Design a protein around this ligand. Structure first.
Ligand SMILES: COc1ccc(C(F)(F)F)cc1CC(=O)N1CCS[C@H](C(N)=O)C1
Ligand SMILES: [Zn+2]
Length: 139
């Protein structure tokens, strides 16, 4: 679990969105595993606007943060869940690191701010859904 809070927005994995998230829907993209909902309280997370390929992510299954090198956002294969079956997920970045399904929602950050959230993983790899391109999160 986990979310990004920026301005009047809440960013979560689409497969983990709640009834409230869907009732206050701003935008969702199944191909990215992202959903953004509106909030009454003001968010203070800074979104990075950069092309960093190094950062630190939070891993709930270990109660630890890990430094990682990660790939550029691209189209990558994702097996089936109760949330999606074999398909290409766009805007995904891979890193060598530990993750378990419950790790989805952990933030990946670089010196510029929030880069994305954990969205997949498997075989010693961790996948992050990028959010740096969503320029509208700040306006
Ligand atoms: C970070 O999640 C992990 C991590 C590891 C494993 C391992 F296979 F090893 F059991 C499994 C998962 C779970 C997973 O990847 N998915 C399920 C939720 S929807 C997600 C997607 N965005 O399509 C795909
Ligand atoms: Zn950066």
């Amino acid at each position: 679990s986990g979310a990004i809070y920026v301005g009047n927005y809440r960013v979560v994995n689409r497969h983990l969105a709640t009834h409230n998230d869907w009732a206050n829907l701003v935008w969702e993209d199944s191909s990215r595993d992202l959903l953004v909902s509106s909030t009454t309280a003001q968010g203070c997370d800074t979104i990075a606007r950069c092309d960093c390929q190094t950062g630190v992510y939070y891993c709930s299954s270990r109660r630890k943060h890990y430094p990682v090198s990660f790939s550029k956002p691209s189209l990558i294969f994702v097996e089936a869940s109760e949330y999606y079956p074999a398909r290409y997920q766009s805007h995904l970045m891979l890193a060598v690191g530990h993750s378990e399904p419950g790790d989805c929602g952990g933030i990946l950050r670089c010196q510029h701010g929030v880069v994305g959230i954990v969205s997949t993983g498997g075989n010693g790899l961790v996948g992050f859904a990028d959010v740096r391109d969503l320029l509208w999160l700040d306006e």
